Amino acid sequence: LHRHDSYAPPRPGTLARWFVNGAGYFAAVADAILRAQEEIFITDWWLSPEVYLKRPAHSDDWRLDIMLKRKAEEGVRVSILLFKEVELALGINSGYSKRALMLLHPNIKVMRHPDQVTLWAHHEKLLVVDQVVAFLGGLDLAYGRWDDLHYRLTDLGLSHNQFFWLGKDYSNLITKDWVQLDRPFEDFIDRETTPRMPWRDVGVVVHGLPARDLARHFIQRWNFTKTTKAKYKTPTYPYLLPKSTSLPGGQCTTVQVLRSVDRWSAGTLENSILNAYLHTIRESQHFLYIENQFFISCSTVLNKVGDEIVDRILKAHKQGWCYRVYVLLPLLPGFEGDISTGGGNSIQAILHFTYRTLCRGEYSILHRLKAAMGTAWRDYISICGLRTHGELGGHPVSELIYIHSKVLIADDRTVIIGSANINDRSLLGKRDSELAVLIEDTETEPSLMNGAEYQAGRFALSLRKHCFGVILGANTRPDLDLRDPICDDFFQLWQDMAESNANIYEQIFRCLPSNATRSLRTLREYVAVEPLATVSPPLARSELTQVQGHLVHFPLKFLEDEGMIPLEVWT
Ligand SMILES: C[C@@H]1CN(C(=O)[C@H](C)N2CCC(n3c(=O)[nH]c4ccccc43)CC2)C[C@@H](C)N1
Numbered sequence: 162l163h164r165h166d167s168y169a170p171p172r173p174g175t176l177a178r179w180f181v182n183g184a185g186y187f188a189a190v191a192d193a194i195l196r197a198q199e200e201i202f203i204t205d206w207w208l209s210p211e212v213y214l215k216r217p218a219h220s221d222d223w224r225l226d227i228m229l230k231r232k233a234e235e236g237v238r239v240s241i242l243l244f245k246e247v248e249l250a251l252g253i254n255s256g257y258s259k260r261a262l263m264l265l266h267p268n269i270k271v272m273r274h275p276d277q278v279t280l281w282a283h284h285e286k287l288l289v290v291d292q293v294v295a296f297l298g299g300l301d302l303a304y305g306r307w308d309d310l311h312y313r314l315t316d317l318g319l320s321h322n323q324f325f326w327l328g329k330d331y332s333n334l335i336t337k338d339w340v341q342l343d344r345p346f347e348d349f350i351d352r353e354t355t356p357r358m359p360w361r362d363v364g365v366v367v368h369g370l371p372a373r374d375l376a377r378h379f380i381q382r383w384n385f386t387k388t389t390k391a392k393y394k395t396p397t398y399p400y401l402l403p404k405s406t407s408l409p410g411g412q413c414t415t416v417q418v419l420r421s422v423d424r425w426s427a428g429t430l431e432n433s434i435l436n437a438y439l440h441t442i443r444e445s446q447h448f449l450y451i452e453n454q455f456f457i458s459c460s461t462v463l464n465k466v467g468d469e470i471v472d473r474i475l476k477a478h479k480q481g482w483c484y485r486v487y488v489l490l491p492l493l494p495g496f497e498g499d500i501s502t503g504g505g506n507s508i509q510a511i512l513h514f515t516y517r518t519l520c521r522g523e524y525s526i527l528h529r530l531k532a533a534m535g536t537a538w539r540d541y542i543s544i545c546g547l548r549t550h551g552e553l554g555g556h557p558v559s560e561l562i563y564i565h566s567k568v569l570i571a572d573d574r575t576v577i578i579g580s581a582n583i584n585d586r587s588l589l590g591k592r593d594s595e596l597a598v599l600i601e602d603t604e605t606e607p608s609l610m611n612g613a614e615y616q617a618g619r620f621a622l623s624l625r626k627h628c629f630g631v632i633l634g635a636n637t638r639p640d641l642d643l644r645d646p647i648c649d650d651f652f653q654l655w656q657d658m659a660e661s662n663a664n665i666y667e668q669i670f671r672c673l674p675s676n677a678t679r680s681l682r683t684l685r686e687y688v689a690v691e692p693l694a695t696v697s698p699p700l701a702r703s704e705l706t707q708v709q710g711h712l713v714h715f716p717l718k719f720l721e722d723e724g725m726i727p728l729e730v731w732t
Pocket residue numbers: 207251252253282284334338339454495496497582
């Protein structure tokens with residue numbers, strides 16, 4: 162075994178390029194698919210064959226199914242493995258994806274897993290071209306993932322099509338889930354009334370040996386699944402073998418591939434992602450920027466990411482060194498449900514576990530930090546989320562930006578980008594197959610750290626500055642300095658912006674979740690009041706001009722005054 166008990170060693174001299182939001186990721190994926198020569202391997206939790214990779218759409222030349230069919234007509238063998246949902250309630254419809262991809266061309270061989278009944282899934286997102294170029298991250302080739310820095314809530318207006326999201330691509334996930342995926346070009350929600358839900362995710366492309374290692378992981382999964390069924394054992398799904406016979410503009414770093422696999426998903430057991438996360442947190446010296454879909458830690462819960470975060474914060478406090486922890490989580494889990502009624506079942510469980518990790522209970526980060534340092538915890542940790550506003554139907558509307566990213570940034574020199582959420586199913590390895598990459602910088606660039614000269618890594622500094630600029634209003638506030646991420650002035654500005662934006666959004670939209678609804682009865686009486694956005698739209702619009710960025714403080718006090726199914730499915 163290699164470092165972090167990983168099947169792959171660190172790969173110095175690796176060309177890697179990061180992507181924020183789905184637009185650039187899909188553009189690079191399409192361009193790489195166009196340049197493919199022999200093989201394309203695809204790993205997805207949900208694949209939409211009819212998704213458009215480049216927008217606005219004026220032709221079918223950039224559709225995933227069309228591009229795969231055209232490349233297969235050139236002699237390229239397209240091996241795809243997909244995840245099969247336990248119940249059809251999960252609207253991925255793996256059967257339709259399999260059937261369409263197979264009907265495209267004989268060279269497109271698609272297999273699905275698991276076949277037996279289990280609580281666990283395949284959450285990995287991977288696309289390998291010629292075993293030389295590997296795209297990974299949290300971005301599936303699925304509906305609603307495509308987005309940009311604008312995070313548009315409206316799409317109202319094929320060679321003259323102005324729609325960025327066509328049919329099933331335009332969706333508000335919490336309002337209504339996908340239905341009837343077999344009809345792609347047909348809207349299931351009204352664009353004129355229901356705003357879209359912005360999507361935020363981070364991916365990365367790696368060139369060279371790490372791509373070969375990701376191809377090796379795909380090959381191991383393919384051969385394991387081949388020797389796991391009857392119809393898949395035929396030569397109609399030939400064996401795949403690796404090769405080590407050894408490009409968009411990126412950066413030269415050192416990239417190590419990490420994964421979470423078990424005997425049910427792959428042939429071996431590995432949990433290198435958890436080890437990498439714990440080592441990066443423990444060895445972090447200045448700051449930790451965490452952007453993850455789920456934050457379930459602080460051992461019902463077994464992973465110890467939160468424990469290491471607490472230990473590092475306490476050690477920084479005792480040693481008296483400057484240290485900031487930025488945590489960004491989506492405001493509500495990615496499920497359909499009415500938050501006015503208090504949410505659904507999965508949403509309630511995920512919120513309960515997240516609040517247990519963060520503030521509720523005695524194992525929570527906030528409780529231990531409080532018992533150690535009083536109210537000083539606000540100077541070391543900052544939990545926030547994203548929300549945006551726009552105009553629709555003559556009135557201001559607002560919606561959270563769903564944080565599907567899985568990224569950790571340490572000291573502007575180390576970056577973990579993957580598909581593994583911070584939860585037991587993705588980090589323990591025993592449950593779900595996940596992929597990630599640890600990227601360390603060998604080339605530095607001048608910057609500031611607590612007011613001192615700091616040789617920050619180019620890749621990590623670029624990623625962190627882009628994240629801060631998008632989260633804040635850098636394009637509208639050119640005076641803000643994003644070079645120093647740990648200093649007192651910048652942290653104070655960050656917290657002030659978060660609190661101000663949360664207050665403004667609550668005042669204007671009366672949105673949920675919020676700290677003004679601490680009980681279910683207060684929540685029920687709170688939704689009876691019509692928000693000012695629909696009362697005096699000019700006044701709310703004038704007030705909203707004070708909103709800077711999309712950052713809003715996380716509602717740690719939402720619903721705070723409140724056995725044949727295991728509790729580990731929502732952890
Ligand atoms: C499928 C469609 C579209 N949906 C999504 O894409 C949303 C955003 N999900 C949220 C849950 C996420 N997830 C995870 O992290 N581990 C998982 C293990 C098993 C299943 C999901 C898992 C994946 C993305 C919402 C859904 C209700 N209907």
